[PDB]
Amino acid sequence: MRLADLSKRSGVSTATIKYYLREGLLPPGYDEDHLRRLRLVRALIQVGKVPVATAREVLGHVDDDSLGRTVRLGAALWALPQDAEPDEADPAVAAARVEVDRLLELLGWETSRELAPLSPVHRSLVVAVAALRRLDYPWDAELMAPYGELMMEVARRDLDFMETHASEAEKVEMAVAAAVLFQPVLRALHRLAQEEESARRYGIELE
């Protein structure tokens, strides 16, 4: 493939590409892997709202050849924008941590229990649960279990999609993309589902 083919197929200006080349986001030359990389960059920036500097670190891990892939994927994923860390001293945070671990135990997400010490995603769940309990909403393991199963089915669908639509993409690249690509549409679907159901149960009309 040529530069023109790369630009026209990616929808990315022939300038922005040269910019990504010198920014390190795109390896120097152009095969289908160069294109897929570009697509990932656009997904990170456009949909993920990820800063260029941050995207550079993420891709750096994706391209790290000094570590095995299992470690690289973790590094790349956790290099993505994350939330603030909680106050472990907060009694609400402690209770939330216990509930979350019981939840992973109930759901059988054993791998997550092992990554838990460093996973910023695990931490965000802990933080979210602590906020609800602080407002006195009894969100515990048993109550979250059904939600977890549902979200797992969503996750399986995201990845099944990636695995087919982008079947030739490098794995780490695929996983990183899936981690930011579907949040906006999933949030929208959930918000609209609540609206639809709220309309059925309580009633919503236009004037």
Add this chain to the structure above:
Amino acid sequence: MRLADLSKRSGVSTATIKYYLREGLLPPGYDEDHLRRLRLVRALIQVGKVPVATAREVLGHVDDDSLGRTVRLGAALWALPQDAEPDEADPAVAAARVEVDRLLELLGWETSRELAPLSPVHRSLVVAVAALRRLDYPWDAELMAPYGELMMEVARRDLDFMETHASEAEKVEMAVAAAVLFQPVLRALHRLAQEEESARRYGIELE
């Protein structure tokens, strides 16, 4: 109930309460409805990240006695923070609108099809889908149907929860709270589910 009871039971400083009183967010006096209102205010601000000025408009609709409840609920919900409007001229937006309508048709969300002209939530789905298609991901009605069903089950669970835990809450108040209360924990659960599944399929380890 007294002022002290109200403050101690709500976890809201006796000052912030007086502030909400003069800000119009809390009706003047204190019954269980005053408490529930306060809880809603805290949920909007703490979890929903809703500005005070915005919360004031939302509650104004909740307390609007010149309109029937079905219209008030819509007004209150859509007064909540929303996303930017799309460029209808964009061919990607047009295609997204068609896909979304086909989706609601497939899912049987007829009420949403009627509120569609003004629903900012409907619009956000349209906007999200257009972004994916712009990146050439074939997200269409048929592909979204399964996700919609899953999210509907999540929605039913949120409301079933509200209906029991806060069974005595005024309906509009309940629906508005449910609309912002569970987004953070649901996002966390989904992100963690993807991480867990990504670990199983591709491999993630700590160093």
